[PDB]
């Protein structure tokens, strides 16, 4: 009883002081910092779908090796979503965002010099590892910035990154690749490639070393100093940008909640035991209800987007191989797609705190469910890019209304471990859908619709019950 009273009120003064200190210069520089990572994210989630399984180049493995390099990235990515997301309830958004860019960046940079297929394996799991912890906690970690106002479409804008860094991965694929002479004594294209992929996430981390630690987890763990220094910098700086640097950040006092290896396994088995607890805490009875649905929208959601998203471009070349009997199309294709959710990402941006979180979710997946019935009449490569870019920019308002949703309904001590292990639910659908659909592929175009049309359909009459967040603090 008494924590929970004592965690509300400090909900309410925190936004009462993210009004005192306003929106404005420091939240925009925080949002291209980690909208950074988010580039990182979309590019590595490209690398994986659509290059890994050697396209073009690599092609010293067999076609089972190809699909298992293309798939248990993904369980990697699984496992750094659960892993940082959990440890950033306990350490902090800052520093585990950092360790986590730093894993991935490391082990990206080392899977452009290995020799042989086992050890890229082995690298690119650890990158997907490091860079599974971008989604919970960025989002999280900007999240604690805003106040309720524009909460939504503050949020909604941060997506565009992740889709810039899709374009960013298929441009420097037909760039760099097809290039074969950009190599030297052997140093082939597709390293020059991995090595290039990589700099979103360096820049990222000089980029994130300049912020400061979110202050609602510095009051959620007792640290009111820490807290009351990082507002008055976000304050300062917005004061000063806007030409009021005479104003003075009056809040005085803000309510806050309270051998080397053997130590190191002391603190490990701590950590473990808090993690363990924030994530069974998860389903305690308050939130069990919201957790349950929320897996099922999670799940549903992302088995259709991403079986139906790998599916595309190999219906496409299967047509085209039927069509010639009568790689760079994979890229552009792919490229297309991803340039098609931009006037989404803008509409929901816009709408997203006029028409609310659970209509902009049930209507996108209702036009998602629709838009999947139109690809029984694919009859062309031309009509099934056409459909692909409909489902996609149809599609992505869904994902931005769960984002939210996901950051609006936990409360800041389990919010990026809630969000975690959502992502890693997500990243297993996404296992789940790209195996399941590659099987249909050339063999019929109605079990793929048919499965993508049915889970989005659950997914709505999940999102349909779960409670609107407008207007509320961030608890
Ligand atoms: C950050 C983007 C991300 C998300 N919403 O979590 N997206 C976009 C569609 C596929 C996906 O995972």
Request: net charge positive.
């Given at each position: 009883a008494?924590?929970?009273?004592?965690?509300?009120?400090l909900?309410?003064?925190?936004?009462?002081?993210?009004?005192?200190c306003?929106?404005?210069?420091?939240?925009?520089t925080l949002?291209f910092?980690?909208g950074?990572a988010l580039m990182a994210?979309?590019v590595e989630?490209?690398?994986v779908?659509?290059?890994?399984?050697?396209?073009?180049?690599?092609?010293?493995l067999?076609?089972?090796?190809?699909?298992?390099?293309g798939?248990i990235?993904?369980?990697?990515?699984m496992?750094?979503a659960?892993?940082?997301?959990?440890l950033?309830?306990?350490?902090?958004?800052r520093?585990?965002?950092?360790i986590?860019?730093?894993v991935n960046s490391?082990?990206?940079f080392?899977?452009?010099f290995?020799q042989?297929?086992?050890?890229?394996?082995?690298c690119?799991?650890?990158?997907?590892?490091?860079?599974?912890?971008?989604?919970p906690?960025?989002?999280?970690?900007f999240?604690?910035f805003?106040?309720?106002?524009?909460?939504?479409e503050?949020?909604?804008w941060?997506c565009?990154?992740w889709?810039?860094?899709?374009?960013?991965?298929?441009?420097?694929a037909?760039?760099?690749?097809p290039?074969?002479?950009?190599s030297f004594?052997?140093?082939h294209?597709?390293?020059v490639?991995?090595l290039?992929?990589?700099?979103?996430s360096?820049?990222?981390?000089?980029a994130?070393?300049?912020?400061p630690?979110?202050?609602?987890?510095?009051?959620?763990?007792?640290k009111?100093?820490?807290a009351?220094?990082?507002?008055?910098?976000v304050?300062?700086?917005?004061?000063?940008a806007?030409?009021?640097?005479?104003?003075?950040?009056?809040?005085?006092?803000?309510?806050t909640?309270?051998?080397?290896?053997?130590r190191?396994?002391?603190?490990?088995?701590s950590?473990?035991?808090?993690?363990?607890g924030?994530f069974?805490?998860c389903?305690?009875?308050?939130?069990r209800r919201i957790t349950?649905?929320?897996?099922g929208?999670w799940f549903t959601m992302?088995?259709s987007y991403?079986?139906?998203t790998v599916?595309?471009?190999?219906?496409?070349?299967?047509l085209q191989?039927?069509?010639?009997?009568?790689?760079?199309?994979?890229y552009f294709?792919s490229?297309?797609?991803?340039?098609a959710?931009?006037?989404g990402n803008?509409v929901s941006?816009l709408?997203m705190d006029?028409?609310?979180?659970?209509?902009?979710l049930a209507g996108?997946?209702?036009?998602?469910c629709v838009?999947?019935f139109f690809?029984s009449f694919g009859?062309s490569?031309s009509a099934?890019?056409?459909?692909?870019?409909?489902?996609g920019?149809?599609?992505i308002?869904?994902?931005?209304?769960?984002?939210?949703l996901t950051?609006?309904?936990y409360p800041?001590?389990?919010?990026t471990?809630?969000?975690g292990?959502l992502?890693?639910?997500?990243?297993l659908?996404?296992?789940?859908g790209?195996?399941?659909f590659?099987?249909?592929?050339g063999?019929?175009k109605?079990?793929?619709i048919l499965?993508?049309?049915?889970?989005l359909?659950?997914?709505?009459s999940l999102?349909?019950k779960?409670p609107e967040?407008?207007?509320?603090?961030?608890?």
């Amino acid at each position: 009883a008494q924590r929970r009273k004592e965690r509300e009120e400090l909900a309410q003064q925190y936004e009462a002081i993210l009004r005192e200190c306003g929106h404005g210069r420091f939240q925009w520089t925080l949002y291209f910092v980690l909208g950074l990572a988010l580039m990182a994210d979309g590019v590595e989630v490209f690398v994986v779908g659509f290059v890994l399984p050697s396209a073009e180049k690599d092609m010293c493995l067999s076609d089972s090796n190809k699909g298992m390099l293309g798939l248990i990235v993904y369980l990697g990515m699984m496992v750094g979503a659960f892993l940082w997301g959990g440890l950033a309830d306990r350490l902090g958004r800052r520093q585990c965002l950092l360790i986590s860019l730093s894993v991935n960046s490391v082990f990206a940079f080392f899977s452009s010099f290995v020799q042989g297929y086992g050890t890229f394996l082995f690298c690119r799991l650890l990158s997907g590892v490091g860079i599974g912890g971008s989604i919970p906690i960025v989002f999280s970690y900007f999240s604690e910035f805003l106040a309720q106002e524009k909460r939504g479409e503050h949020l909604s804008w941060l997506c565009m990154f992740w889709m810039i860094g899709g374009v960013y991965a298929a441009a420097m694929a037909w760039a760099i690749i097809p290039h074969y002479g950009w190599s030297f004594q052997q140093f082939h294209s597709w390293r020059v490639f991995v090595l290039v992929c990589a700099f979103p996430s360096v820049f990222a981390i000089g980029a994130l070393t300049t912020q400061p630690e979110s202050p609602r987890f510095f009051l959620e763990n007792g640290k009111h100093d820490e807290a009351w220094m990082v507002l008055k910098q976000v304050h300062d700086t917005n004061m000063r940008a806007k030409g009021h640097p005479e104003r003075v950040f009056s809040v005085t006092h803000i309510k806050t909640i309270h051998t080397w290896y053997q130590r190191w396994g002391v603190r490990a088995l701590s950590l473990g035991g808090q993690v363990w607890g924030n994530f069974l805490s998860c389903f305690g009875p308050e939130y069990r209800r919201i957790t349950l649905m929320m897996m099922g929208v999670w799940f549903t959601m992302s088995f259709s987007y991403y079986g139906l998203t790998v599916w595309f471009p190999d219906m496409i070349r299967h047509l085209q191989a039927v069509d010639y009997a009568s790689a760079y199309m994979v890229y552009f294709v792919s490229f297309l797609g991803t340039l098609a959710v931009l006037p989404g990402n803008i509409v929901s941006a816009l709408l997203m705190d006029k028409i609310g979180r659970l209509r902009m979710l049930a209507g996108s997946s209702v036009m998602s469910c629709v838009s999947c019935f139109f690809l029984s009449f694919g009859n062309s490569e031309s009509a099934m890019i056409a459909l692909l870019c409909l489902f996609g920019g149809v599609s992505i308002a869904s994902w931005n209304a769960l984002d939210v949703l996901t950051v609006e309904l936990y409360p800041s001590d389990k919010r990026t471990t809630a969000f975690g292990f959502l992502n890693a639910l997500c990243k297993l659908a996404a296992v789940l859908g790209i195996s399941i659909f590659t099987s249909f592929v050339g063999i019929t175009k109605a079990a793929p619709i048919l499965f993508a049309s049915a889970a989005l359909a659950l997914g709505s009459s999940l999102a349909l019950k779960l409670p609107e967040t407008r207007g509320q603090v961030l608890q």
